[model samples]
Target chain A: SFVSNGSNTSFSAEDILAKAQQYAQEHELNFSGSLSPVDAWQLVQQGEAVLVDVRTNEERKFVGYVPESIHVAWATGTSFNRNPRFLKELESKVGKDKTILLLCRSGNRSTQAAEAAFNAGFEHIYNVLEGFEGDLNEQQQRNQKNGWRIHQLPWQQD
Target chain B: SAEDILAKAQQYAQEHELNFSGSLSPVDAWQLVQQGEAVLVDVRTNEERKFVGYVPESIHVAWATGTSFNRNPRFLKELESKVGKDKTILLLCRSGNRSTQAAEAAFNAGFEHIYNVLEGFEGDLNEQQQRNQKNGWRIHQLPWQQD
Candidate 1:
């Protein structure tokens, strides 16, 4: 259902998403695919996509996040209860047609959020792998693996 | 003694054609701090220090600001006001890259003794393509605080 404008000279958001989807299909991923934090930042910086932090308000306040990201919680609290109004909030913050990149503390929750968004008929959704802090390292510490904060991207706390 | 150290650092700089005096490992920088022979100047943005982590007691003088990471235009003037030109200053940043650039700026501004903290506060990416491993101030378990 996606079409290119026939001009291959410039990279379009749709083209990028299509390529990402192809990569995902090859990897047996259910959602579109995953992007590195840097790539996602570039997409947002270029105005080709929107970054949405799907973590709870508490997590964001306690942790750090990209400064320009839009907050939309997929789940909340210590119990990790799914927000009933996720679809409504997402639609209100970032319409159905806009390309959205979801992020969380780790990549796991964002993937789930991406799948949920896809099932809700939002076609252009991607997950930021490694999330904000990244996976715990061998020493049981974080920020040592691939993530937005480790990459030294523009982010803030509080 | 400080002058001798500064001379040695300057010689290293001239030999290497480094923009600043020279560089120091995280441990060496900490030693200087412990001895009160040098001041650790954190050049990372305030947000990074606030959220990620920061070395306690290090002077905060951002080399850049905002999400776009725009270069601070008054970096030299601000540095002069806070730490002065003759002090043995050790600069630090996220990955040791920005501090190197900051050291160069300080050198241009007539700061005679400047040392960049190699590997920065976070250090380089590890085998997993991440940071805070293999090397860095925090990885060294130096004194730092997080919010």
Candidate 2:
């Protein structure tokens, strides 16, 4: 399990993959972060991996989101506790050892959430860093932030 | 821990018959006074309020503690400037933790009616709360369009 570091918790997608690989090797679980939306789409097309969206309800509704991404909140409230339904919800779809790719608004929340999955005994947990959107800097403070929108990925809203 | 601070602040408020607010989100704290009830007194440093945003029309005590929330700075003198020795004062902060500490300091300084706006101004919410799912000033759809 990843250690908590107050508000300074963050990691790159590549770094998360390395950790996931280690976890898989040690515990016989399958996880990878080498997939992009294109990679995710290709894998799903080839029946290789499943794409999961871990954003909140408001984010899914107001910000608009990827059409095929499954919605589950990674962190729902002001408190720091992990979601109790995380393991159950995850298991209901993808198998324990499937190549599960997780996504969120920015990479930060997803990275932390992926760690939560790993801690919950799910071996195949991968984080889509740069998430649906990339990290927040001066350029991406508002709508221009990186990730799906900046990358021009496909999305739909009602 | 914010809970520990709240407990202390709550005790002080109860002893003096003061009301405690939550979250301490600057906009809501400002509105509380704008609607005409109590005064919004910020005990944080000028730097925090300037760089981060704080309640407008808030009397900046600049020192409910001797120092900032992390480090105690001199606060009693500045606190006295805006607050009478025995007036009911409402305190607020970013997440409610620091304001609780500040309110306690004021109560100890002999200022009665020290009600802490619980949750400070931004009541505790998870990332969703961080994403705006609760009733803080920002989520409450209050005014914060200026900055």
Candidate 3:
């Protein structure tokens, strides 16, 4: 059971995910559900969930990344070739039973990863909405449309 | 008026045996900026300001640098070159904690009118253990820009 909202009341992470799943069902989302970067950050910090960055190693090394997030590339290379060992890597490193929250450059790749994880018998998979860098704004710029770094959360560059 | 404020701050710091000129709430720091009474000195790393966010028109001086987060040896020199020692300076950082250390460094560097901005630019962590939601310069909706 996880303490939602820092109160004494305890609820399982699965229970919270179930509520999100219901909302996703109502909204007709393809994946289980999505969480805001802040929500994802909170869940990770609270030890109730695991944050898996699904961006390429190049993207993380060049741009920025959350300090303690697990790095698991969904795809790699200039052509964006899908990693053949994604599920195997996930199972070995993070395990299928953990509450996995996937993040990427703009929440797109992570969606793909989450969908694949769902098919892999991982019931507690979630996607981080807006991802690490977030979506492009009116000026074709990122970080303005609400992402992890945009929220001034703890992140660092290499 | 600025002299009086500095005098009172100095007195407070002396009485309390504080290291810096004392601290100011985010609101108070903003008001000081608004009134043109003091200069806002952002002492966060350059990467932090560029990636996270920054207070508009604040003086950019990195008290540290790189992933190692090494303390900048040229901090006082750079700070003096930018704002000098006579001006009433309000120091700011990511979470207000580092700014206190920056303030202390500035004071030791012979800056008399240095004050720390409490709660910093991003503020303290909330019960959710997240920042910039509960209290901070950004949370207060003060003037800021992101790159």
Question: Best-fitting candidate, measured by lDDT?
Answer: 1
List, residue by residue over A18-112, the lDDT tens digit for candidate 3. Answer: 76677668877666778888877777887888989998765565456787899889988544789999999999999989888899988789988
Ranking the candidates on TM-score from highest down gives: 3, 1, 2
Worst 10 residues of 2 chain A by lDDT: A8-17
Second chain TM-score, each model: 0.89, 0.64, 0.87
True contacts kept of each: 0.06, 0.00, 0.00
Q: CAPRI verdict on model 1?
A: incorrect
Question: Candidate 1 — which pairs collide?
Answer: none
Q: Which lDDT tens digits does candidate 2 get at residues A13-42?
A: 444346546654665533333345554454
Distance from true location, Cα of A21 in model 3, Å: 15
lDDT of 1 at B29: 80
Residue B8 of model 3 has an lDDT of: 63
lDDT of each: 0.80, 0.57, 0.79
What DockQ score does model 2 reach against the true complex? Answer: 0.02
The weakest ten consecutive residues by lDDT in model 1 chain A span A7-16
Distance from true location, Cα of A2 in model 3, Å:
35
